[PDB]
Design a binder for this molecule. Sequence first.
Ligand SMILES: Nc1ncnc2c1ncn2[C@@H]1O[C@H](COP(=O)(O)OP(=O)(O)O)[C@@H](O)[C@H]1O
Lengths: 157, 236, 157, 236, 311
Amino acid sequence: IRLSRSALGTAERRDSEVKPAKDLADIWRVINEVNTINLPTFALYNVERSQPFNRNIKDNTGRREERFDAYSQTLGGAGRFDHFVEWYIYLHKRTVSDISSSIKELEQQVNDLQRTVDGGMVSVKSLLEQMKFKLSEAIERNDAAVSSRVLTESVQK
Amino acid sequence: MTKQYERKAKGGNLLSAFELYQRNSDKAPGLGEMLVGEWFEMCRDYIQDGHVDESGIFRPDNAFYLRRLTLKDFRRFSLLEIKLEEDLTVIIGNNGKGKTSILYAIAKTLSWFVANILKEGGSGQRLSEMTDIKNDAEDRYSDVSSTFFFGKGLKSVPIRLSRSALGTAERRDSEVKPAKDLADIWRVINEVNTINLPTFALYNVERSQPFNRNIKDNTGRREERFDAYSQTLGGA
Amino acid sequence: SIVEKAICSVVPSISNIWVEMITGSDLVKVTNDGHDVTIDQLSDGQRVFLSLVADLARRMVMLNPLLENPLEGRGIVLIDEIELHLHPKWQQEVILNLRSAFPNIQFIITTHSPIVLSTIEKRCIREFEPNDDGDQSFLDSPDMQTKGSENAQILEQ
Amino acid sequence: GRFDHFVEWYIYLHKRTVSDISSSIKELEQQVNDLQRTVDGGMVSVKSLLEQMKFKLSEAIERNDAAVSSRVLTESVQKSIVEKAICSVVPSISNIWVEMITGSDLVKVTNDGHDVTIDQLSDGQRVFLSLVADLARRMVMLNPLLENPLEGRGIVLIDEIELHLHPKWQQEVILNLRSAFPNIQFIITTHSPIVLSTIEKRCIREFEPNDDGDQSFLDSPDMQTKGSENAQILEQ
Amino acid sequence: MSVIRGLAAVLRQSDSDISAFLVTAPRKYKVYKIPKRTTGFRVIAQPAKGLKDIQRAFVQLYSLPVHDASMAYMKGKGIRDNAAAHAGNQYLLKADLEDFFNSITPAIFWRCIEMSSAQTPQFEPQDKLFIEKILFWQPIKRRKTKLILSVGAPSSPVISNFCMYEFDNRIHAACKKVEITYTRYADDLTFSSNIPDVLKAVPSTLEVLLKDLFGSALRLNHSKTVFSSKAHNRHVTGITINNEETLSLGRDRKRFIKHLINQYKYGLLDNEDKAYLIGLLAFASHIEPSFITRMNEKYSLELMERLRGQR
RNA sequence: UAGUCGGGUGAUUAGCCAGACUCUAACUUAUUGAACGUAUU
Ligand SMILES: Nc1ncnc2c1ncn2[C@@H]1O[C@H](COP(=O)(O)OP(=O)(O)O)[C@@H](O)[C@H]1O
């Protein structure tokens, strides 16, 4: 892989040659898409690593959980320690709670609201428009946790 | 072929002379010295020739200016043609007639010249696919055709900017190759031997902004020559 | 020297421009109507026009190193609403000053003013028909000779 | 002026006019009636985590009495007042409304019989539109107790009132502003005699050509500018 | 067997051989680049020898109608006739079509076949696929639907002339009423008239007629629409029209030829340039016979005779 | 006035001389293929 640049006004350019790197990364990405595989970890730690810790953490829940968040600002020179704190607290919340019950109460609201479906209004979809397939998407997301795939929160922690 | 290019170049054509110079230079050093050749001298003389007129002003032998501008389905124009003057052209009208649109189209056309002067095969600005195409339209695409004059050796440099509207299966392409060729001539000749480069500037309503020297603006060493093409067609 | 001469010749109110280093922030000073004033206390109309002229002169000087007068180089300059923030007294001479300073530049200019048109030949004007919806083609020059004409007559015709 | 704030406020008005509160409070009451009867027997688990919407019902009861206790105008009435202020002052604009194009709500206007959006507006029309729209929004929001909120007290300062305006529009920029906002004290500066031709001589303060700041009072011109020739105002 | 039977009777080959050949026929093309005269390259698709013979036989077998306003690719007509059609006039409106040859598809060909106002040879529905395979070139291997005419082929010129027969007829009929003469060298719509301010409305008529006939497939090149008069240069498909309303090669080309003959006079002209000069002189004799007489007077008759040679 | 046309001179694509024109307004292009001219034939 070659990273090239040329000055302004030169008669001929110097371009990059990143095609083999793109080919290898395409192999990695496609293989991972079809079947989960282990991915390399690229990180850079500069002298900006030494920065103060600002106590509280911004609760931007919804993105520290995805697998590809490990590549977020991975080569910025300073490790995302706030991201680590959010992820660690998220793992603790899923370990101490939300796992002893597991899928026990989440599917119960469907049966409970079946009463409103039958003996309430003629047809109810507005009240039950999300969780019906939200349970299915949670199941197909945690299938990695329950199989030889993405680890459970307790073992990760 | 070499014979036809020599016949055209000795007649005053600049493109043929540059083609001969390139084919000599990229060949063995027996005929290619990158300069001190008949064709390179022809090209640099064509670019650099001039004379001081009776009033004391240097007048180049081969003037550079825009001849025609065609706007097809561009903003409010279904099909418009203009006959830009060699020295000064004034566009007048009421509000919302398209004068700013005409200037915007001309600036977009000149952006390709600027980009290919700065950077080989560089990409200039393109027409917006959200606002530039006429709202009514019939084909949901817009064209901006321009013709430039660079002396008797290059009487026409046709460049067309085209864009298709959002959600259109057929996309229209732009014909910007002659502008790239002319800017390649300028850039190559300049790097081999310093020449005078054209100035392309746009001063739109985005000027008159308050304050001056807002930030230190770490942007590329204002001292160097090719900093004169940086944000030259931005409007301010 | 070339840039200073261009700035002083084109802009009517400015008589001189220089840089002071004492009071050791670098600052640029001009002379408006005989008063030495800094660059930030300019008005809108003398600062905008000066900005245009100075930028154009800088680019002409930097792009034309082999010319005795770099401002005599070739190029295309687009100006929108040239009479911006200009008093009618300034509008009577802006076109002439610009054409004198940069004689080889192709100026393409839009304006809403009869005062500026009074200094421009009829052949150089491209007008829009008042009752036009965009179907008109191949714009035309006016009939009445605007150069040297009365401002009221230009407004009328 | 905050024209983006005006656009957000206008889209809010459109949404609350096309949705209204009488078509949401009754639905909330119906849902509460259904759920309370459903949870009457027991198993209040279907309401413990559904209590959020029941409390949001009382929340919506709040911030709604303020719309009845402060005597604020109806959102549709405010929209109509702002629209008629915009259309009657800006010459090119005929009507203005909001559409749900590709989901997002965007504001469209009518220029010379065509239905371009705000981003397609020319700089001359867009600036005047932004000025009048911001002023109308501020007057409507600050004057809830008037039948016409535009007839309220205030002081508005405009610099270069004729900015980006064609001479045809300058003949009617003062009269339209005075008619739309009768009770505002307008303090303006101008560079055009066409605007001065529509202004009383008593309302003009002039700086002498030979003035370095040593003067002590701003006098009115000797000639009556209202109804005078453009050449006469230019000369005297 | 219709088309294949006639092709077999012409080529003296079996039906099976031709039918097997006409399977990848839209694909049997050799594409190459030729140098442009100023700069760049032009891409041309030329079919193989067997497909070339098949196309020639198909062209000679079936005679598609062509209009008199067309001047390209017919016997006895060419550049001189196209230029002399507008020789005596005062104003011209040279115009061009956008990507003329590659914009013609089998859909256009079959649309033009059915609605042609003149006599059209009868093609059975069974052999339409063979017609498409014979006449049309298929760029892009994966896309079997994209079939276009290739500029440069034994069959492309006649198909292109036929596909514009209705356009030529209607344009000529419209132009004769307004005292405008119209010719087309297969990409160069030339309109000329002695009436002022009459050519302004021609481009709009061309656009509406093209939309009516070919829809969006064929479009005018708006950047190639040129208005000219006796105040400016006037040339039609390479022949300059003088202010004396006569055909000419142009002053610059005449001076170039004079310089070449002068170089030959002192023996400073090599064999390649000598052959080029002989070809240019033959072309000049075709276009400007008086130029040959002028050169005979200026450079003596014996020098010219030795330059052109003897039989 | 430009710009254009091009008859002549010119070791000749340049320079010059004479003449003429002016719809708001040429920008000379592409092969081996097609037709045209020319040469072998
Ligand atoms: N895509 C478009 N389709 C149709 N009309 C448009 C489009 N974009 C802009 N317009 C209209 O065309 C005009 C553009 O204004 P502009 O070019 O800035 O003119 P000016 O400088 O003369 O005021 C306005 O009237 C605007 O409403």
